[PDB]
């Protein structure tokens, strides 16, 4: 099947008692892990942010701000809600065994600081799984950048697939 | 020496606009992106239309004016030259009334539709196109006798061009009667769609069309026009994708089936996607996981779906028994779809496709082949769709007699003639 295996969602835990709207607005990508591209050209991957906009009908309208080919480019998706909240989906559900095959699962937060995020992605028998270390700030401390580590390992992931993107301010600032 | 579209896959860009992006123009922004097509090893480009044609209106509708929004008769040219020479070809899509509903005009109007295409025909051929494509032929009165003609016309002005007709149709017979009024014609169907994709069905489809076309050079598609991956489940993509480079005959693909892009969603205006050259023209997929889904992100990813097209693509154009060679079905376990390519005493090509989501035994029975075709105690596997097994054992020598397969997992095995 992969060439790096996925983890079971049983082995992926879910944030208590999700504030989805505590969770809203700007978040910074400070950590990037998981079995598929860590990379958008030839360097290390950049910086980039995601703004999750809870819409009335209580999913994400979620842009992903992007700096590519020295320009900003905005990567608009809608993230509708699945069995619990803070699970979401993404495009059209065909089956209900293929109803996880494309899932957001927010792991941990204290929405003000930071937050873990996991995404499940299936391609031809095969599952893409990352984990997004989001903060407010561009920064964030040893402890919670290890925690992340720890986290990563935990799910099968090697120290060389776990990424710190490299800060930028072109487009990421606003 | 064969025929040019023998040589390779084919390649159809409906929409220049969608295919290049806002970035440049249609035709003029084509040609910057030959280089990539080249990594592709396709033979022929199946462009447009690229005509003016005003809904519904036949006497607003000329079939030799480009849209001036796509570019000149000077940027096409300049088009044709370039592709020429990276060895590429350009098929004209001519299906006249493209923006409307019906693509032929009123069935009683086919016959002024006819004289305009006759006089396309010649205009064109001179401009330099190697062949021409006609599609929802079955939305045309009398398509058997007109695309005879159409053969006839392009005929009597040169020999080596191609016709591809297309339909809706997914009926063996209605698809036959089309092939058969005309001669050396490519027919893009349905066929391979209309399916339970069990491998006793995958391989009834293929072994039945075989023995009703007999020798005649067929083509292999999923559709006319649409995208792989609308017609496809999922799980069989990388399956499909290599049954059509390995089955005898020229494969005929769609830009973004080496990508595996969707078209509109069942809940939009039918309209063609944007080729995803980078995150700058992609839709419905956010990060981290869109890093893997545009041309920069599948070029380097050994897993991705552009280098295995890459790779069989590769092997179809240089490997003699994959270029022109026989067919024969062998006897496998049930909904295990295997069969060999052959020519002369060239390397033979041993395909293996396990169809259900399950370890299973192949069970090869080679008993009833020619004389001098016998399967070998191992051979070289060149490609596993299993991307876990390919990083783990391409190029490796793999035991036949108790060969097992991954579930959806497709072989492709090499073994040498001996003497």
Redesign the interface.
Known sequence: ???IPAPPLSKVPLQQNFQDNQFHGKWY?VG?A?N??????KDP?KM?A?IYELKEDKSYN?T?V?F??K?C?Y?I?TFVPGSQPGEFT???IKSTLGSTSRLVRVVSTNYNQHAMVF?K??????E?F?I?LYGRTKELTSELKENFIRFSKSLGLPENHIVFPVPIDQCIDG | VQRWWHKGALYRIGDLQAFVGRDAGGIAGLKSHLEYLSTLKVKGLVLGPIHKNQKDEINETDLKQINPTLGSQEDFKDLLQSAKKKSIHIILDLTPNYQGQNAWFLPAQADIVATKMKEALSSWLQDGVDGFQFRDVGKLMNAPLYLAEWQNITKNLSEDRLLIAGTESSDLQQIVNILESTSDLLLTSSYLSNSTFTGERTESLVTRFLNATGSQWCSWSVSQAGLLADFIPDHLLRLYQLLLFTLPGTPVFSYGDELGLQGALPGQPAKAPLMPWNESSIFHIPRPVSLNMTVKGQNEDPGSLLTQFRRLSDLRGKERSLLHGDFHALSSSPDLFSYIRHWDQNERYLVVLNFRDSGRSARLGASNLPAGISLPASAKLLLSTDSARQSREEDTSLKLENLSLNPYEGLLLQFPFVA
């Not at chain 1, 598929?36 to 050209?41: F, V």
């Not at chain 1, 992605?121 to 095969?126: D, F, G, L």
């Open positions: 099947s992969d060439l990508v990037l998981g598929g591209n860590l990379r958008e050209d991957l980039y995601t979620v992903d992007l590519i080919d320009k480019h990567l998706n993404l495009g059209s995404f992605w299936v391609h031809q028998n095969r893409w990352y997004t």
